[PDB]
Amino acid sequence: SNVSADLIWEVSRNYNSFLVKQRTGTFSRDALNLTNQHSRKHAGFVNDKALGIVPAEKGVKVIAKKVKAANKPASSLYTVTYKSTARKAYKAIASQAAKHGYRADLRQAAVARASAILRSQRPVKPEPPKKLRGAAARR
């Protein structure tokens, strides 16, 4: 037809509302964007098959695009909430990312994002007190 993921990337490669451009890099605010980078590999809104991982109250929440429901946005996302052991979460995420050929190139990034969220959900250790240094700061 006249619409494809390649065309959507050609349209929105230079500007879209998710784009965050600065001097040191270009980022993306997309929900379906792993590693939050502006590229064709990670443009979840562009690609027909895409994955995204959002933190929950405990654990992760993985949404995936449904190919047969592209024009129905309310029913286009397949959502699984993993509130369990981290190893089982990584196993299931890699299984839905690489076993059936559904974006096997995003497997490492998805497992990494799940691990990052599970690290972030841990309690934060207290920081050591700041040491005063020198002459004017010390006295």
Binding site: S1, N2, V3, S4, A5, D6, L7
Partner: protein
Amino acid sequence: IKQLDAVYESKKGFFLPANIVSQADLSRLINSTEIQSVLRAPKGEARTKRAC
């Protein structure tokens, strides 16, 4: 949405435009059997080893 077709048919001197590309899925075009079966073998990889 029923009147849209009649609206675009009633415009004088204008027709629905013809595209220069018939199949917009470049991945299907490239990875189709018709093109891939006649391709020359690859002459390298994405990353090239440094020789010297």
